[PDB]
Design a binder for this molecule. Structure first.
Ligand code: HEM
Ligand code: HEM
Ligand code: HEM
Ligand code: HEM
Lengths: 139, 145, 145, 139
């Protein structure tokens, strides 16, 4: 991640603020509706609209991304325990990290008119790929 | 394979699309976000910056044709194979574009639509469009199948 | 979309396949190399080691069915969609296996064939089989298309 | 890469020895024949069988992999100049690194009956993905 990439990701995303919990919930719903294969990882969730579990989990996802931008230069060690979880316990298909990343970009685009520039869009996609790379590095 | 509700969602939004701008906005972002696609647009000239790509007139002119192709696909969701046959031959047998870039361009387009329609591009609306762009990419890649 | 020469290459090699062993050899390597596919085989029991997977009788029994499906596809290279229709419904609408794993299993199979036939699995022979496994994966994923 | 993975990759591959130049040439030919989209990166090569250019380039590819196993704990710095080349100058489609990796596995399988065990196969696939990750990390 280039210095400009880090600047852009701190920017795009400072603007997400206290909506971050609600944006991650929306990203999941977007993933569940657009790519139904992903729902089989949440058989024990009520994946309906406004589900308290999707909201609660979207907040955890968003917080993990906050922690990643806060430690962007040492993400493997910050996301270490999440890497073990997603690869060992959950064996998440690596394909699925691209699906959620795409929905995270869509969610940001739809909520950040001004921030989602072509350059910021490019930086956010690099950021989410690095997070995805870390979360898939433990198979 | 769209429902009446998904068709309704897709055409209602598409009617509001600025077909002179959206195509080039998506092709440009493709060239910026996935810069290896620039390999196929050496003739277009200045792609050295994000501003250069977006403001490059050739990128805008070409994306207009690309969006022209998407509009045709929307009007023939039940025969996307035949619609994109000649474009498949071009992109597959002639240009040798890896079909994974079709999926990427489609998802980039989805991002452009979300950018321009905000709350209106709801999760259900997105689901319908993901089916559309998936079908276009699969149709455009038929010559590899 | 195979030539007479590629068909000739594919059937000549397939006639030498030990259909009681090759299927399970490939499913096992899939479960070992891409361990997230084990998520769909919790019932099979001990998958804790490479030795456990390969020597697991359920893996061998199931792979035999999988290779049964590939043999059927080879006999109907011109109608792979119809051949795998019911398997598509199963793997797509019921199991929700991401179709990228079909490509992986196919490429794993290619590795197994190279392993067992050595120099005989020439680059041209491989090219023909890559077409075969690509078509199977695409057919098995039709219910997503 | 786990300690066992490194052991396996030094093993599989010690056995490749002085054939390494010929195996990389075979891997490329396998890629060119099975995935013809990749040939457009070599318009200036004669990609026919026995081509001196494919042999010469296969040796360079194999040597780079040798250098990677020799510096497996610091591959980003060892493969640094190749990362700039493949991403900046050549803009190689990241998809294509999976195609060549698969053909490298096929080539090894067809030449190393005894070594290509399920575990070694798994380790080699992890090794080539890491190399691919490094060579695609500079877009
Ligand atoms: C940027 C990508 C991702 C991030 C940051 C992320 C983050 C998280 C976090 C923070 C947790 C909670 C861990 C805990 O509470 O101990 C979690 C759990 C989980 N994740 Fe993810 N995740 C990502 C991608 C994915 C994907 C792509 C899938 C599946 C398609 C997935 C499926 C799950 C599941 C099923 C759980 C367990 C939920 C539960 O049991 O309540 N994750 N993830
Ligand atoms: C995914 C959906 C895509 C659609 C609907 C589409 C559509 C089109 C259309 C309508 C043309 C004009 C053909 C003509 O003038 O007769 C074209 C040409 C072209 N496309 Fe695409 N395209 C897609 C993806 C891509 C991608 C992903 C790339 C490269 C990474 C690409 C590279 C090109 C090039 C280089 C040309 C110029 C061909 C020439 O003039 O010889 N296309 N495309
Ligand atoms: C790519 C080519 C594949 C072929 C040709 C194939 C073939 C088959 C066949 C013949 C069956 C037996 C169906 C029956 O008993 O009626 C089956 C079942 C099954 N397959 Fe596959 N398969 C493929 C890929 C996969 C992959 C990649 C996965 C998982 C990652 C998978 C998971 C399963 C499971 C879990 C079952 C058991 C379904 C049940 O008994 O309810 N398959 N497959
Ligand atoms: C493990 C994966 C790979 C390795 C280790 C590798 C290694 C190398 C090396 C050592 C060179 C020579 C650099 C020099 O002499 O300055 C090179 C150049 C090149 N690579 Fe790769 N490469 C890999 C993947 C790929 C892929 C997947 C493609 C395309 C599909 C590709 C296309 C090229 C091209 C076109 C050149 C320039 C050849 C020339 O101009 O003579 N490489 N690569």
């Amino acid at each position: 991640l280039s210095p400009a990439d880090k600047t852009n990701v701190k920017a795009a995303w400072g603007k997400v603020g206290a909506h971050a919990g609600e944006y991650g919930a929306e990203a999941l719903e977007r993933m569940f509706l657009s790519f139904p294969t992903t729902k089989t990882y949440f058989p024990h969730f009520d994946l309906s609209h406004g589900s308290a579990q999707v909201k609660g989990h979207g907040k955890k996802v968003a917080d993990a991304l906050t922690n990643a931008v806060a430690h962007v230069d040492d993400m493997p060690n910050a996301l270490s325990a999440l890497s073990d979880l997603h690869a060992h316990k959950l064996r998440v298909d690596p394909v699925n990290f691209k699906l959620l990343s795409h929905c995270l970009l869509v969610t940001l685009a739809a909520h950040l008119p001004a921030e989602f520039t072509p350059a910021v869009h490019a930086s956010l996609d690099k950021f989410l790929a690095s997070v995805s790379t870390v979360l898939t590095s433990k198979y | 394979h769209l429902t009446p509700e998904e068709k309704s969602a897709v055409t209602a939004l598409w009617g509001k699309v600025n077909v002179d701008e959206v195509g080039g906005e998506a092709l440009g972002r493709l060239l910026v976000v996935y810069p290896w696609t620039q390999r196929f647009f050496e003739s277009f000239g200045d792609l050295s910056t994000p501003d250069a790509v977006m403001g490059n007139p050739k990128v805008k002119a070409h994306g207009k044709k690309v969006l022209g192709a998407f509009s045709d696909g929307l009007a023939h969701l039940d025969n996307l194979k035949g619609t994109f046959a000649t474009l498949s031959e071009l992109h597959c047998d002639k240009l040798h574009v890896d079909p994974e870039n079709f999926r990427l361009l489609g998802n980039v387009l989805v991002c452009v639509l979300a950018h321009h329609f905000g709350k209106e591009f709801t999760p259900p609306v997105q689901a319908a469009y993901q089916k559309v762009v998936a079908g276009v990419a699969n149709a455009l890649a038929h010559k590899y199948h």
